[PDB]
């Protein structure tokens, strides 16, 4: 009853205060990401803003490659996100050596949520103040096709699939735009051009700025080219004009 909040100890209302304080390290940099999957692709947009003009803008990034078919964005404390990439690259490689096949995206999200649960149960270890968003396309069963996947793991360890997610500062106004857009159409029937307009407009409704094409970076995975790659900046400009239309 002396501290109640300084190490991983249950509060008298049954909460962990080092979990609730690590959620606030996600919104503390002030950034934002939006992920969405269409019928045949996955998209991840994120705010890529450099305040200093003397900074090399192609070094600071949040989009990482875990395996050649899984990409991720790390929204939260930026050196903590680089730490969980190196953890996920070890787990995807040790899956490859031991089991011979590439790791499923739903399984790589589960094995990274088990790493976050241990750090919030042992008293000495600090939780990672970052929300991971592992995106990719899994091999479907009984037909052999590919299927878009989005998986998000909290700093507590809450893994789960998504149709469209958001993380960072004013992530509540980004969820509210996507649910309002969900009431009209059905997001698993839209195309890659149509779904790119929503994830960029959801990034506009929260920041209220209608940002430039260099102030974001977008990575994608498509059923034709299943490898994770980031888009060119010229293709973001073809999308930002359509949102203004």
């Amino acid at each position: 009853a002396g501290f109640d909040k300084y190490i991983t100890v249950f509060s008298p209302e049954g909460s962990l205060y080092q979990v609730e304080y690590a959620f606030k390290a996600v919104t503390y940099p002030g950034l934002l990401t939006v992920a969405i999957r269409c019928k045949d692709a996955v998209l991840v947009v994120t705010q890529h803003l450099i305040p200093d003009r003397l900074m090399r803008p192609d070094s600071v990034t949040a989009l990482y490659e875990v395996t050649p078919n899984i990409g991720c964005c790390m929204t939260g404390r930026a050196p903590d996100g680089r730490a969980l990439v190196q953890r996920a690259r070890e787990e995807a490689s040790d899956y490859q050596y031991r089991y011979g096949v590439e790791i499923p995206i739903a399984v790589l999200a589960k094995r990274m949520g088990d790493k976050a649960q241990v750090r919030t149960q042992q008293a000495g270890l600090r939780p990672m103040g970052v929300v991971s968003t592992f995106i990719g396309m899994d091999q479907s069963d009984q037909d052999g096709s590919l299927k878009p996947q989005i998986y998000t793991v909290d700093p507590a360890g809450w893994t789960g699939g998504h149709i469209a997610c958001a993380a960072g500062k004013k992530q509540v106004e980004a969820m509210a735009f996507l649910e309002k857009r969900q009431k009209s159409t059905e997001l698993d029937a839209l195309t890659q051009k149509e779904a790119a307009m929503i994830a960029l407009a959801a990034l506009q409704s929260a920041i209220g700025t209608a940002v430039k094409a260099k102030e974001v970076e977008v990575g994608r995975c498509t059923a034709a080219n299943p490898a994770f790659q980031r888009v060119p900046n010229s293709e973001v400009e073809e999308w930002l004009t359509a949102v203004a239309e």
């Binding site: 000495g124 809450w158 893994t159 699939g161 997610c165």
Partner: protein
């Protein structure tokens, strides 16, 4: 590396850390189960935080082997350590006796994992309870562990928020010779009276262990039951 214990005794003589963990294990969603003469039903409640969280992906009824299942109510990621250790201890029984495990011996093993972290150095107890149910060579079983390690042998019970007024509803509706189809009829019916909105096939998740096998019901077989109650 912080090898001292975090859970100790109080001047009143109570493990106050485990008392806090039972509060944490009662703030989950309502999970329940009933028995019958022909099988055991377990019923969950997949609470979606939004409409964009892929209700077919998240799951709360966990199948452990070809004869055991489970459903939790508490801290989600704390449960996955318990299920992965229960799926592992059930495969070690088949590599050593060539026999499905009994529901008694599996629950004694996972109760030694709760008690292990209430007497270890540097860890906190679990913040979730389970509902283990399945078959063995002497009938049908429905157990319910606690974060203290204390396990029970219930006949119809419920855990989570809205559990004491749903467990009292199980007293009024249980009968000693309930059949299996009568059990699913009343396990879904005791979810509805504490449920907020309108339960759908992607909103709850049940699994009824039948005759040798646990078999989580699909979205088509559970849709058959919702428009019958």
């Amino acid at each position: 590396e912080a090898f001292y214990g975090l859970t100790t005794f109080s001047p009143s003589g109570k493990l106050i850390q485990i008392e806090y963990a039972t509060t944490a294990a009662g703030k989950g969603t309502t999970a329940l189960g009933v028995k019958a003469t022909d099988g055991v039903v377990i019923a969950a409640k997949k609470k979606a935080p939004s409409t964009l969280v892929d209700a077919s992906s998240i799951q709360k009824v966990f199948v452990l082997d070809e004869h055991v299942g489970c459903t939790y109510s508490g801290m989600g990621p704390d449960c996955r350590v318990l299920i992965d250790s229960a799926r592992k201890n059930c495969q070690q029984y088949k590599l050593m006796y060539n026999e499905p495990i009994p529901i008694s011996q599996l629950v004694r093993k996972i109760s030694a994992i709760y008690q292990e972290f209430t007497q270890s150095g540097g860890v906190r107890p679990f913040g979730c309870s389970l509902l283990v149910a399945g078959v063995d060579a002497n009938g049908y079983h429905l157990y319910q562990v606690d974060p203290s390690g204390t396990f029970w042998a219930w006949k119809a019970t419920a855990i989570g928020t809205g559990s004491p007024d749903a467990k009292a509803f199980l007293e009024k509706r249980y009968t000693v010779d309930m059949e299996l189809e009568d059990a699913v009829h009343t396990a879904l019916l005791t979810l509805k009276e504490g449920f907020d909105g309108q339960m759908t096939s992607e909103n709850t998740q049940v699994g009824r262990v039948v005759e040798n096998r646990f078999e989580i019901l699909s979205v088509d077989q559970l849709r058959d039951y919702l428009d019958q109650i």
